[PDB]
Design a binder for this molecule. Structure first.
Ligand SMILES: Nc1nc2c(ncn2[C@@H]2O[C@H](COP(=O)(O)OP(=O)(O)OP(=O)(O)O)[C@@H](O)[C@H]2O)c(=O)[nH]1
Ligand SMILES: [Mg+2]
Length: 172
């Protein structure tokens, strides 16, 4: 079985790497061919924290605008949300502010939030400095990490940290 079940959501503009982050976390693999998510998808992985078994039910939203009705319906049950942008795409970083408004208008007001700056293996095409990502997350009081699904950087750490913070809030 499991001791806790945490429903998690990945949100962010299309193309930032939500599906590849989840594929790395659930299957420890990376595919370079862009296959945009249609509607929604999910993966399930159970981790251990403090000797407790935490089942992570992770919903991978479709970032394309025409799927917003489906994304919105998945906000209510969520306990933690990854807000993903692409360090090579300034617009996806700008839009983190709008994804935050979306979360706070629909999700439970207590939902745990974390910002991921993905594709940090592509330093040659970086547009969003790490300093600016840290500052935005500081402005919102949110944790922040740069990740790479391709090189498997901070993917484990992002999900384990988010789960730990959800568990800490529950255990208090
Ligand atoms: N170099 C590099 N490329 C990445 C990384 N993560 C994702 N990509 C590439 O970025 C493209 C988009 O990745 P996806 O995971 O499909 O993006 P998404 O956010 O799920 O997009 P939608 O499903 O349309 O919302 C794909 O071609 C990936 O291979 C990464 O960490 N590093
Ligand atoms: Mg996807």
């Amino acid at each position: 079985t499991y001791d806790y079940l945490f429903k998690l959501l990945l949100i962010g503009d299309s193309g930032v790497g939500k599906t590849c982050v989840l594929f790395r976390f659930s299957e420890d693999a990376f595919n370079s061919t862009f296959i945009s998510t249609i509607g929604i998808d999910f993966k399930i992985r159970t981790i251990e924290l403090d000797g407790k078994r935490i089942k992570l039910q992770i919903w991978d939203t479709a970032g394309l605008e025409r799927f917003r009705e489906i994304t919105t319906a998945y906000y209510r049950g969520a306990m933690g949300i990854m807000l993903v942008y692409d360090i090579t795409n300034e617009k996806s970083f700008d839009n983190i502010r709008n994804w935050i408004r979306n979360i706070e208008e629909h999700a439970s007001a207590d939902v745990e939030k974390m910002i991921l700056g993905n594709k940090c293996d592509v330093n040659d095409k970086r547009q969003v400095s790490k300093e600016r990502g840290e500052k935005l997350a500081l402005d919102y009081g949110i944790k922040f990490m740069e990740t790479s699904a391709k090189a498997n950087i901070n993917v484990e750490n992002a999900f384990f940290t988010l789960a730990r913070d959800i568990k800490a809030k529950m255990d208090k």
